[PDB]
Write a protein that binds this DNA or RNA. Structure first.
Length: 90
DNA sequence: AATAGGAGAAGTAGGG
DNA sequence: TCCCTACTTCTCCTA
């Protein structure tokens, strides 16, 4: 399979869905979702995983919040903004 | 009212 | 026979 953070970084480094996700500072590993178009990106993540239900941003964020312990993805005080770690970027 | 944010509980998929 | 990993799903509260 493929992990959730690896899936978001690939979209960023392929320029796929520029309307749903984008860098805020490639150096700081900061990225942000689109308020009005994030669900389109959420739908893809669910289909690509073959999940039983339709993936939503709420369920995707619930999984992103787990990365706070390990450290692959940390939340930022900005709206819909997150940040990769220096390790994953490498 | 809208939107984002959070998380415990219990569950599935896949591998060992 | 069971557990680990990595989410997933549902529900409820909160800013």
């Amino acid at each position: 399979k493929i992990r959730l953070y690896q899936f978001l970084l690939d979209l960023l480094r392929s320029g796929d869905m520029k309307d749903s996700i984008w860098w805020v500072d490639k150096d700081k590993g900061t990225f942000q979702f689109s308020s009005k178009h994030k669900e389109a990106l959420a739908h893809r993540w669910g289909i690509q995983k073959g999940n039983r239900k339709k993936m939503t941003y709420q369920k995707m964020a619930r999984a992103l919040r787990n990365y706070g312990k390990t450290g692959e993805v940390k939340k930022v005080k900005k709206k819909l903004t997150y940040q990769f770690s220096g390790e994953v970027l490498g």
